[PDB]
């Protein structure tokens, strides 16, 4: 049932945000030690768990970009597209609120101790606990290219890993492998844009952060062109390119 | 036989404590380098091994909260509940004593060198080698919420990973995946409460620490409200919520 | 079709370079924290993904040394050898350009801040983002021995992991295991030569770096004997020794 | 054939030493960054590869303690025991020489720079590249207890992971899981004795180090009672206890 699938997409997208935003909060306001690979693998494995938990019900999209791509290249029912996307964004938003609720005291004490005014340009760093912001050395277009390229890779390898006509079928290994994939994408490109590669994963938490006191910078990142647009559209375009590329360069040869 | 199952629960719960408490002792009194993810994955993988070693005999609960939940939602024989719980707590207690026995000299030399009086408020840090204590910035209720939420997630994903009616059956991958799950829970929430999520894993070692010289603070954590109550009840409530939620939101849709 | 296989070899070799060179760029010009094991496992897992993505089409060589060895000991069609090698080198070259394009600004800002003249001997460090260079304490012959030994091990274990007549068949685990293998080779020997073990992985990116401003040192490493020859021939010789050794010492006993 | 099996045991034991001693050399004389978990997982995964490479031929003992235990509790042919042990020790010795050969220059330059006299008490640290030595805070008996306990755990879980009558058969996952097991044992207890848990893994390299200039301290560790005896006998006793315990406490209940 569609209602059941939306609930699963809501929970699954929320789960991956819980683990992902959770470890970044630990890093930023709890003083926990994590390198780039550690934060990346925790997020990737968290996604794997979200898939194992929802694959049997909704097919585990947990990403607006994947939903749209599966509709354009995998015959996914277009009538379930928007319900899926709303469920995903809502799930991400709620999980972000939940993580903030559990780490509540650490955020304030950290802001007090380091004299950080929530909502100021300098608070964009802590807002980074919930969503992504560009590296100081790159611009809007540069960041857009990164998100596009990585989501194309994301979609392409997801189809490859779940394509039973490509080499030996992965079976129950698929979700795990998809998580490991997300881990290497995050570790190799994360310093540039935080590798959002998922509109719901970024927008939902940004809306929460906006409501929780970070204000307008939660959306703009303090840049001339509102940054939120990159994590919102870059992945959608990328996922489409990736799906197309797989069927044309790899599928058409299997 | 019940006697055989209790022995398995005793050994399995003891195994996961050996590895878990072992690496924390290495971190605290042996100067070994470990980040938050490293200590968490070692504990998670250790749990996986404990499951592979006991699944075929007792079903590998190794956690009072899981035993109680499987009794309320999985038709587990209520006559085996208490025997299982006593075996689990006893196993955790003995493994803690074993780890202390092997690291014995390092504890004393560390306390001597850093002028730490065992049993004082400041010794709660080393007592943390055996069990969990709250982050300095959060209170009793806050810590209770964390343990509840994470154990609900723990139970929910355990049912999902072992549910052959949900997506492609995991088979022998299940225990490993459950260990990886524990790893991401510990890495994303560990800075808050040490992610006990298991009454036997926390209480047994606390009793040992109490007997080994840490005294009353082993139980209270040096807080107004004795902390041990959180790791004791928070997980039980959480496991129940998690089991219920899985069958209602995911099971009823498979 | 050969055309389809060349495309797959081009994409697969390009993928492993994207992830590999990507994380090193993060380390060198983005200030990301990675230990030796982290950079090594990211590269190994990246290779695994490249295999899952191309195994069903070309058999996933993604390495000139492996192609040549499979031709000499696995009956691989010699008519596909050169097309495969050209595809591999081209793929590696393009992925290197792509990574440089995404990290563009960080390279220049880093060179400006640290007063590094691209093309000078001291820029060999940053050129190391794309390919391999010898440890300061070893010479040409010493580096040649390392690459030979590790590629022999690489080839030998690849045959062992994909040999269904050796123990229980790995099935879909094979690519993952091959990635983990590459990870341990890189972590245990990487400080010596960067463990190239693949002519295309090293030469293609070196040509790009040469074109991108690093000049002649990209090829020589600033050494009397042009270093590029080691990563070029050491692996080919090694792969052959490894293949031979497997069939004679392990295969002939199965 | 026995000759073929001895060759496999020689290569497999040599492989695990190559990776293991290799990464420690990187840590000690090449300045590579590795935490306790990283060095431990590299060694564990290296063992897994050694098993995948030799399981089909010899059954992959790669450890004198395991060979002796399988003879006493698994009906292993006693006529193959000594040939297996000699092959294992020889393999470990040769791999140690090989790693020293590749890192040759770094050892000398490090000793020159830090003014270390090879063979002196203070050189025991570098000798630790090849084999194990006790933590400064524990004595002979204490170290003996550690090796005994961990090898008992090692043997017990190896039987459990390879016992098709215990839960769902692991199949091709077994070797990997055994490697992960070795990883958690090394990470949780490594700071105490270096977790040798294998007579060949320790003695062979100690003999090499003795011959390579470290002299008598390679065997004694600079202690009153020659340390080499612990890694030599502690594991044998432990493996026997572990095998017995598994069949009595877990097997007899399956
Ligand atoms: C799941 C529903 C979550 C609703 C949003 C709750 C946000 C609570 O967040 C609060 O927001 C206030 C207003 O910005 C700030 O002043 C407070 O500092 C902040 O704690
Ligand atoms: C599915 C997602 C739809 C998003 C629609 C655009 C929402 C943009 O959100 C807007 O961002 C501005 C940034 O300057 C703020 O000033 C506004 O307050 C905010 O509403
Ligand atoms: C497995 C059974 C374990 C029984 C408990 C052994 C505890 C030994 O621990 C000892 O306890 C003493 C009293 O608190 C302290 O004074 C010592 O410092 C401590 O080493
Ligand atoms: C299954 C677990 C049952 C636990 C029952 C409660 C045991 C509490 O333990 C008590 O904690 C107090 C904390 O101030 C101490 O003062 C007491 O000495 C100690 O016995
Ligand atoms: C995929 C095709 C890539 C072609 C090579 C593009 C290299 C762009 O690189 C440019 O090269 C110039 C000349 O060396 C340098 O002066 C510039 O600093 C550098 O950015
Ligand atoms: C398949 C790979 C074929 C490589 C053929 C050799 C290419 C060597 O390349 C050469 O290296 C020299 C190093 O000093 C440079 O001076 C030259 O400019 C460069 O063309
Ligand atoms: C595989 C066969 C290996 C045989 C042992 C080779 C040891 C080479 O090692 C050498 O040993 C000399 C004598 O101790 C030392 O003086 C040298 O410094 C050392 O490099
Ligand atoms: C299978 C392994 C058999 C080992 C037999 C004992 C070998 C001990 O080796 C001995 O150790 C002494 C330590 O002080 C040294 O003085 C001797 O030179 C050395 O031969
Ligand atoms: Mg690490
Ligand atoms: Mg790791």
XYZ file of C-alpha atoms in Angstrom, chain C residues 137-233:
97
model
C 65.101 6.684 1.783
C 64.968 4.139 -1.066
C 66.367 3.996 -4.598
C 65.183 2.914 -8.049
C 66.029 -0.794 -7.713
C 64.608 -0.895 -4.198
C 61.336 0.636 -5.421
C 61.272 -1.767 -8.365
C 61.482 -4.735 -5.979
C 58.534 -3.435 -3.920
C 56.210 -2.994 -6.923
C 57.226 -6.414 -8.250
C 56.584 -8.212 -4.972
C 53.241 -6.529 -4.266
C 51.817 -7.016 -7.750
C 52.834 -10.689 -7.641
C 50.850 -10.922 -4.397
C 48.009 -8.951 -5.987
C 47.714 -11.247 -9.010
C 48.157 -14.419 -6.968
C 45.373 -13.585 -4.509
C 43.073 -12.360 -7.282
C 43.266 -15.799 -8.932
C 42.814 -17.488 -5.553
C 39.765 -15.378 -4.664
C 38.149 -15.995 -8.073
C 39.127 -19.690 -8.338
C 35.950 -21.709 -7.747
C 38.052 -24.840 -7.358
C 39.761 -23.456 -4.242
C 37.690 -23.908 -1.101
C 34.144 -22.551 -0.906
C 33.302 -20.312 -3.912
C 33.152 -16.608 -2.964
C 30.502 -15.616 -5.486
C 29.485 -11.929 -5.047
C 32.032 -11.506 -2.218
C 34.978 -11.765 -4.615
C 35.174 -8.100 -5.734
C 34.817 -6.875 -2.128
C 37.547 -9.244 -0.960
C 39.818 -8.077 -3.790
C 39.263 -4.517 -2.589
C 40.131 -5.458 0.989
C 43.240 -7.160 -0.391
C 44.303 -3.952 -2.132
C 43.667 -2.135 1.137
C 46.098 -4.298 3.151
C 48.738 -4.146 0.411
C 48.487 -0.350 0.366
C 48.600 -0.035 4.160
C 51.558 -2.373 4.689
C 53.723 -1.213 1.781
C 52.327 2.169 0.784
C 54.961 4.235 2.643
C 57.589 2.791 0.300
C 56.274 3.353 -3.236
C 52.613 4.312 -2.922
C 51.806 0.762 -4.068
C 50.969 1.573 -7.704
C 50.734 -2.105 -8.761
C 48.953 -0.958 -11.934
C 50.641 0.722 -14.962
C 47.487 2.566 -16.070
C 46.753 3.840 -12.552
C 50.178 5.502 -12.448
C 51.098 6.501 -16.020
C 47.798 8.050 -17.098
C 47.683 10.447 -14.101
C 51.396 11.248 -14.491
C 50.754 12.355 -18.072
C 47.910 14.548 -16.866
C 50.042 16.093 -14.111
C 52.814 16.695 -16.656
C 50.310 18.581 -18.847
C 48.776 20.442 -15.896
C 51.905 22.353 -14.935
C 54.058 19.940 -12.920
C 56.312 19.457 -15.930
C 59.162 16.956 -16.158
C 59.299 16.113 -12.423
C 55.874 14.476 -12.804
C 57.726 11.709 -14.674
C 61.091 11.696 -12.895
C 60.032 12.374 -9.326
C 63.182 14.486 -9.292
C 65.409 11.398 -9.360
C 68.446 10.551 -11.517
C 66.608 7.644 -13.126
C 63.071 8.651 -14.236
C 60.838 7.081 -11.595
C 57.831 6.501 -13.869
C 59.599 3.394 -15.209
C 59.168 1.569 -11.886
C 55.331 1.858 -11.695
C 55.292 1.004 -15.398
C 57.349 -2.207 -15.511
